[PDB]
Amino acid sequence: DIKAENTDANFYVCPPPTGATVVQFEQPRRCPTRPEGQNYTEGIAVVFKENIAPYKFKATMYYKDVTVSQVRFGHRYSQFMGIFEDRAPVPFEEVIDKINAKGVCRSTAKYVRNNLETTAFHRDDHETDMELKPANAATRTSRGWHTTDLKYNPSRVEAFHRYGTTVNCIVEEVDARSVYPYDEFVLATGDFVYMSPFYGYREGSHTEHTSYAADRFKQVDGFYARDLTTKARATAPTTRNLLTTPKFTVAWDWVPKRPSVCTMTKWQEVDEMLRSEYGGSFRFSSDAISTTFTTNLTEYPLSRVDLGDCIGKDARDAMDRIFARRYNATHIKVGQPQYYLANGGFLIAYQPLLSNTLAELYVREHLREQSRKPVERIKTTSSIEFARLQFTYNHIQRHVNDMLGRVAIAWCELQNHELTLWNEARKLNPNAIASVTVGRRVSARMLGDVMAVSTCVPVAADNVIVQNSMRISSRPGACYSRPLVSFRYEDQGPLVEGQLGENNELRLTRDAIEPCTVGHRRYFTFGGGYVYFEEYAYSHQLSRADITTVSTFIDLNITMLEDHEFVPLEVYTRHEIKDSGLLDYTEVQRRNQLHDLRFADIDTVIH
Amino acid sequence: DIKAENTDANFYVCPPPTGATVVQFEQPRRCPTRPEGQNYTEGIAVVFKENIAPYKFKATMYYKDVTVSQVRFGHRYSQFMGIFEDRAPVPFEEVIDKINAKGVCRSTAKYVRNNLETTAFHRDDHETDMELKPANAATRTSRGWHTTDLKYNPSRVEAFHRYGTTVNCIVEEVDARSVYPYDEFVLATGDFVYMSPFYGYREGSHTEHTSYAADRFKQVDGFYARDLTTKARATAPTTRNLLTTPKFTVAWDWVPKRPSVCTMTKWQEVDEMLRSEYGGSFRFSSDAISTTFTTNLTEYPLSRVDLGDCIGKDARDAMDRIFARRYNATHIKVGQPQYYLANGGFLIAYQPLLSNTLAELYVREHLREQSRKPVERIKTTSSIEFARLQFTYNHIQRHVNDMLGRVAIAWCELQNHELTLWNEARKLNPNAIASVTVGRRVSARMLGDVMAVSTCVPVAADNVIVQNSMRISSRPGACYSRPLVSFRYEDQGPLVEGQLGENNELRLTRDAIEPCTVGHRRYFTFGGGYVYFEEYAYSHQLSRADITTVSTFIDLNITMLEDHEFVPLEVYTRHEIKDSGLLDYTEVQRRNQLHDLRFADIDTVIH
Amino acid sequence: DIKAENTDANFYVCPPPTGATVVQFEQPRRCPTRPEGQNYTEGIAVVFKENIAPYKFKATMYYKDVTVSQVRFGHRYSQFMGIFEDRAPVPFEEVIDKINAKGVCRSTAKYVRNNLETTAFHRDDHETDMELKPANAATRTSRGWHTTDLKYNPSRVEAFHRYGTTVNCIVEEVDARSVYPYDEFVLATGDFVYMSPFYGYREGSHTEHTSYAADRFKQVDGFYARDLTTKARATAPTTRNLLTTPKFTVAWDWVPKRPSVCTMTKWQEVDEMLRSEYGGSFRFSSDAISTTFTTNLTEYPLSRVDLGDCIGKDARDAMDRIFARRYNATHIKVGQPQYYLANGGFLIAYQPLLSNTLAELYVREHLREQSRKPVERIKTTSSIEFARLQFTYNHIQRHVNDMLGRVAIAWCELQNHELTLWNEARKLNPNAIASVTVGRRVSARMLGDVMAVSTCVPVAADNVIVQNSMRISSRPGACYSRPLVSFRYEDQGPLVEGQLGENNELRLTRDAIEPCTVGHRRYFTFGGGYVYFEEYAYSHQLSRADITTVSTFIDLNITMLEDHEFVPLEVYTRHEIKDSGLLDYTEVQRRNQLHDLRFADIDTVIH
Numbered sequence A, B, C: 001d002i003k004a005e006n007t008d009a010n011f012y013v014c015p016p017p018t019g020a021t022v023v024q025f026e027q028p029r030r031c032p033t034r035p036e037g038q039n040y041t042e043g044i045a046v047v048f049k050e051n052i053a054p055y056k057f058k059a060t061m062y063y064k065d066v067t068v069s070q071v072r073f074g075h076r077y078s079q080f081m082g083i084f085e086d087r088a089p090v091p092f093e094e095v096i097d098k099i100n101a102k103g104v105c106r107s108t109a110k111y112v113r114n115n116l117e118t119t120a121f122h123r124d125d126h127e128t129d130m131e132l133k134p135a136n137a138a139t140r141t142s143r144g145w146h147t148t149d150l151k152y153n154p155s156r157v158e159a160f161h162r163y164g165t166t167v168n169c170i171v172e173e174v175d176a177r178s179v180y181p182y183d184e185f186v187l188a189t190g191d192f193v194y195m196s197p198f199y200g201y202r203e204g205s206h207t208e209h210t211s212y213a214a215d216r217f218k219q220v221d222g223f224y225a226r227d228l229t230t231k232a233r234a235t236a237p238t239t240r241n242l243l244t245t246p247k248f249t250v251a252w253d254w255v256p257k258r259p260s261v262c263t264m265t266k267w268q269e270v271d272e273m274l275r276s277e278y279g280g281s282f283r284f285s286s287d288a289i290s291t292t293f294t295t296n297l298t299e300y301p302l303s304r305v306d307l308g309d310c311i312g313k314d315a316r317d318a319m320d321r322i323f324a325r326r327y328n329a330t331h332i333k334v335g336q337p338q339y340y341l342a343n344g345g346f347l348i349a350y351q352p353l354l355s356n357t358l359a360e361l362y363v364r365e366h367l368r369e370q371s372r373k374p375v376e377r378i379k380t381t382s383s384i385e386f387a388r389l390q391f392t393y394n395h396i397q398r399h400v401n402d403m404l405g406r407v408a409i410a411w412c413e414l415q416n417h418e419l420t421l422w423n424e425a426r427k428l429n430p431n432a433i434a435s436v437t438v439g440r441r442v443s444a445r446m447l448g449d450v451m452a453v454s455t456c457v458p459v460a461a462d463n464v465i466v467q468n469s470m471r472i473s474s475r476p477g478a479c480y481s482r483p484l485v486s487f488r489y490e491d492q493g494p495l496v497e498g499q500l501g502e503n504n505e506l507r508l509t510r511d512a513i514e515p516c517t518v519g520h521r522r523y524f525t526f527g528g529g530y531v532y533f534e535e536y537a538y539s540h541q542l543s544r545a546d547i548t549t550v551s552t553f554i555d556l557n558i559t560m561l562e563d564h565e566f567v568p569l570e571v572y573t574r575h576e577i578k579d580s581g582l583l584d585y586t587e588v589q590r591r592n593q594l595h596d597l598r599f600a601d602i603d604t605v606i607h
């Protein structure tokens, strides 16, 4: 009669474990260990980049503006028939004697042009010396001086003098620049000077390049300049270089090549650069700038660079400087500065430090820092993102490896310990612990130290009926603790006798009995729900919902890291920068060289 | 006789816990809490960058091409002895009266050159006015017009006229550009005009810079232009500026400085910029562009910028625009736009939003958004990678901190709860729970609420023999549940009597007995394996391998994040860009100024 | 009398669970599954970028330097009154007949200038042919040749010859460059040639642009050049282009447009580019370069590009090359190369591979790789950081999602399994398991398969006294196992009788008794500590500290990922690059065009 109302469940006939099949629990696994901690060397670091700025220096030009006009007069009007313009060099001798000495220039110009020695007379008059005045003030320009402010033109009546010669002697202070390898240079005027800024006579200067004839170049020793405005002469003297070109004479103070140019530029000072050896490479990290560089395990000889004699000295100045402001107390140096070549073409100067705390290895370390110890130009990349990605990935990589490492270690330690809990629980309830461990409904029992298991058998719910009395009629005072049941293995078969174990297990022997008692209330797992009993008499049925639920579970909500799309982004596009410069040479040239195609006629022949 | 076959194990004699040493389990620890959730302000944002484009405007040049040729004739041939070329300005008056009015130019040119007032006659003939025609079509150029298409040269017979003057009046529409601070400017021709585009007479224009004499500049009020092709005059008038230079007269419509130039440029519009205050700085995040900026907690006054009056207005236009298309319904604004200065030199306009949902704080928030509330130019960096690294690290940082936080919280909660399981397991098996907790083989027993522990003693395996009967001969019906054993503490010593506890513990008192029974099968942990018994009679030995193994362990395979190396990578190297421009000025100059060293002789004097 | 010394605790009177309230444990939850594993296609890849380099080619210029000087002599001096300089084209005919054939030039120059046909005579003497010599050696320049090295000037006595004409015929080998769309081009001299490099007569060359008159251009078929130094003529012939401009004639070998220019440039070869379809886009990853690109699911037709016929062929050459060196053995290709357009404007050529191992799908896959299968110019971004961020985030994203996924899965599996432990522990100690699960001090007991719970009641410590005898006087031989106690529910109330359960639970019925015994030592949780008993006689009190503590906890120390700030960092700032070029055009122009404002007088009129 009484069948389960919660049809939606399963019953299991669990054979007495014959003893034929025996299993053992797996015993505590070897658990991993926290990885060996990587050692970091503390240090001061200076990072260098390829130098891309020109060598820059001061020069002074000496030339005269020569103009020869050809004039012609009509009735109440005059026209230029021509205007000759040229630039002429001031001779060495006039620069020293006249100008530098007295601040004066000759009113005539005499130089070589088109293979001729030529002479021009201001106003076509007799030669004098003229005083030099500042050029009219102009915004953002270096200093200039000139003698003449007007262009001389012949008057209408001078019928034997239809040409008019002007001379304006000009001195200018100009910036000069020279690209590596400093074989020639330019002035601020746009004029190329095809001689090394480092060319000269003394100390292997005569090595450097010159495209000129020897007499175009003078090197004046013990030279004292004389400001042309203050009229004051310098306190110390220089080695004054002068080169006369066809259009100007240019002076400059001679200084040595190697102490003046360097192929590398200091880019970053880093207080704490962390050095950690691994992978056959060193790695250098700076959290200050969030950058990580990677060099070979061997030092890079500073002697291997061309014109790299700013590096050695640039490193130390800043280091000593930093070490003072940060380490002189808590720390000391270790060994003499080292140099390594990072990918990206960076050059790192590194000063190993040491806290007095670990002073015990001073003697130890002082050796190691000398094992990596020991011509070309280094191309540095424009983008540092790689070393910054490297830094970021690394920092994030190590962190999760560590905390997930630690997690994993605990998990194992926790499996090992809970076994002990299962070892006691097996004995209390072998069928359930077996069923769960083994991973299928089984019947089990201890055979000493191992467990026997037999595989259960399913029975339906329409194939399962319940008896409404747990009271043993013949033996009053004695009662079934749980309920009795009848069932059929298949939907239509002999109905069997047994009692309801836990978890809908159908137990064959009705052998589980207690001494009866009063108040008897019970709830017995029955199908998808519970069956209820008062005083060993079947009362009614229920569903799990009909009972409040509490949990034996510890909570944990993990959510995944969302997908994210990184779109291209640039502060200024390649064209914005192409459009930032005021004048564009290509554009101007193109336009200019359209003048005659646009406005005139380049093909027609008249005659 | 019977010694263990699995020699590879250890036995422990466990003293009865004297009671001398008592321990307690540690009780539930205080478990951490999920960090206080950081609040995000929703907003619309506009980000600005340093402006690096020139101020660009339209101008018109007026000048005439003047050519004076000098010719000479041989028998059946003629040669140029010279060609004078010059550019002359069109006077103010001719520009207005002749050109703008009628589209005509005078055929003569009269201007000042080299301190002379000079006059040129097309064909050296009498003055007329000539019509202006478009310049011959050219690809990609602005508009031009000219009067003359041929160069006038004197014919062979004209023996009293060996010079030939040409005049070609030219008007061009050209682009003009001016860099900050807009004190001078350039034309598309390459010509510098050394006067502010904003120079003029009205409203403090006369403030701006001019390098010219006053009469070179005219400001024509109520000016109506007349297209020189359509012949149509403009519908409205302008304030027309004209400056006569020595080589051309240049006009342009006068417009005010402050409403025409801005030192900042809008770069990004962001619908949702998230504002979260922390660390004494704000942070602004955009997932749309994956960028995170960092500003001080105080607003940056828009009045603090020079010529920054595009910013205020540029912000609002887009915002109102965005707020409409996205927030007018679900949201409202909060307070008046604010401005902050990010590192990298970015300027963020931010419009705080609010969902009608949280409208309850409208009154609250409306105050907070006014606490940070209130000359120089801002340099913006070219690289945004920092703010994008920042964004990425932050998003990844917060996520693991959170899920590992949650993990940690559960772990603790799980240790606290399982204790309760150990508290029941201690009572069932004190030696084992003690041994594991304590972390060494001990003997234990409850002394009420605390546990007593004594440290066990090791015994070898050759020092351990087993008895092959668990049947008590004298007391049939009574039997040992486990096996009896004999052993010696040291390899050669008095053989002791006791029985085999669990886990190879050697128990001294042979006191563990049961009522005998039938079918008796048992397996007892013996050395590295098990000892087997049927009916209280020793049968044989086994190894763990000889028994199938199931596991009481939950699985978890963590693998570490692999090491990864980020190599330098650039879309175009610094040289590729240096090689992208069609013409290179430095290169051309260098080459050109080699012409005479290469092809001619600059030193030889003839005479 | 005896009250607890550790006042700092709580006692609970736990009502016998009336049975009124029943709960059930929650049963095993459904646990999540490891996400479906994403499939990666192995491949070879070639990535292309917008081409930004000019089309570069070789040309040869032919022109003559013509100089006409005007001289004048004073007593012991001479002055240049003028110097006419011009460049004249070499006619087509002289280039072929004289130069190319014999390495000679005519000593006269005849070309059109200013609408006149003009003729110049070296030394004003009769015409000859002159031999061509190399230009004087110059560092880093292409080849040149000239006929004349001196400038001819008339001597002092030649009173009927005051002008002096020089001619220097010049040939140069120059680089020429042309920007897209290759309509005009430039020479190394700075000269614009306003004709397509691809202009010509044959095969639709006459399509291309020319700004010149037809007779300025010749196309010489079957042309054999003759080195002007080695005097050796080429082994094969070319289609020689010649264009005469007003200032020079320029030759070059004609080659077809489409096979000579390409709008795209190969940037990267990638051995393993991993292709994984998701989100309606493909993704392409390279660990070699740590870059991830994102394209639409459909192929991008190579026929869609303008002048993109370098791409098809450039792809295969490298691929076949790579496939050989890496895949020909372990792998094979799959389908014909495909092309996709990534964001950032990158173009990826991809060759799908396949290990012989999975050869079983060769037939399957061979179809799929053909489903995405099929004019403008592509702008590529300068910054690749996005695709590298993308790559890094993705790799880090997937990893934590995976290991935290796996973690979560275990956690659940572990909650499910431990329930079974709680199911056995409930029966051993219902009050404690109830109290913990339920989450408040309760009293509990099994009612079959569910648990009854009643909520306990707090009692103070001053409200709790202890009896110093556990020995039952009237029933010697029988003794309380734990202690007896008296207490009051409120500070001043009837003192109640009961005994001390565990965990400071006050049990009402003094029903827990044992048979007395000897040695009796006990410790009973009492307040914040323990109460101690020897032989059922109260001895003294203690604190937890007074007892050593061991732990039932597995350890786990998680630390959070630190906050990190990424500061802007650039290898070279925008100005450093602006300052890297030797000569600056804008600067030079500005300065130059200050010459007269600085040094002369542009306003004063004399007469």
Ligand SMILES: *[C@@H]1O[C@H](CO)[C@@H](O)[C@H](O)[C@H]1NC(C)=O
Pocket: A294, A295, A296, A341, A342, A343
């Ligand atoms: C390291 O050494 C190898 C060969 O020894 C060389 O090819 C490589 O360029 C070096 N790299 C660096 C970072 O110095």
Ligand SMILES: *[C@@H]1O[C@H](CO)[C@@H](O)[C@H](O)[C@H]1NC(C)=O
Pocket: B294, B295, B296, B341, B342, B343
């Ligand atoms: C923030 O304030 C400090 C001093 O108050 C200043 O030095 C710093 O430049 C400011 N930074 C920003 C991002 O405005």
Ligand SMILES: *[C@@H]1O[C@H](CO)[C@@H](O)[C@H](O)[C@H]1NC(C)=O
Pocket: C294, C295, C296, C341, C342, C343
């Ligand atoms: C993908 O397709 C959409 C429309 O179909 C188009 O707007 C978008 O530009 C395409 N993106 C790529 C990466 O090709």
Ligand SMILES: OC[C@@H](O)[C@@H](O)CO
Pocket: A221, A222, A223, A237, A238, A239
């Ligand atoms: O006047 C001496 C000075 O010019 C030194 O440089 C020489 O070595």
Ligand SMILES: OC[C@@H](O)[C@@H](O)CO
Pocket: A591, A592, A593, A594, A595, A596, B087, B189
């Ligand atoms: O060819 C140069 C010409 O275009 C300029 O002088 C116009 O101003």
Ligand SMILES: OC[C@@H](O)[C@@H](O)CO
Pocket: B221, B222, B223, B237, B238, B239
């Ligand atoms: O014609 C009037 C117009 O030029 C205004 O700009 C004057 O303010």
Ligand SMILES: OC[C@@H](O)[C@@H](O)CO
Pocket: B591, B592, B593, B594, B595, B596, C087, C189
């Ligand atoms: O000095 C200028 C010269 O090199 C060019 O005119 C050659 O074309």
Ligand SMILES: OC[C@@H](O)[C@@H](O)CO
Pocket: C221, C222, C223, C237, C238, C239
């Ligand atoms: O001499 C033949 C050669 O110039 C070929 O290019 C013609 O197609």
Ligand SMILES: OC[C@@H](O)[C@@H](O)CO
Pocket: A087, A189, C591, C592, C593, C594, C595, C596
């Ligand atoms: O205007 C050109 C002038 O500044 C230079 O020639 C000076 O060298």
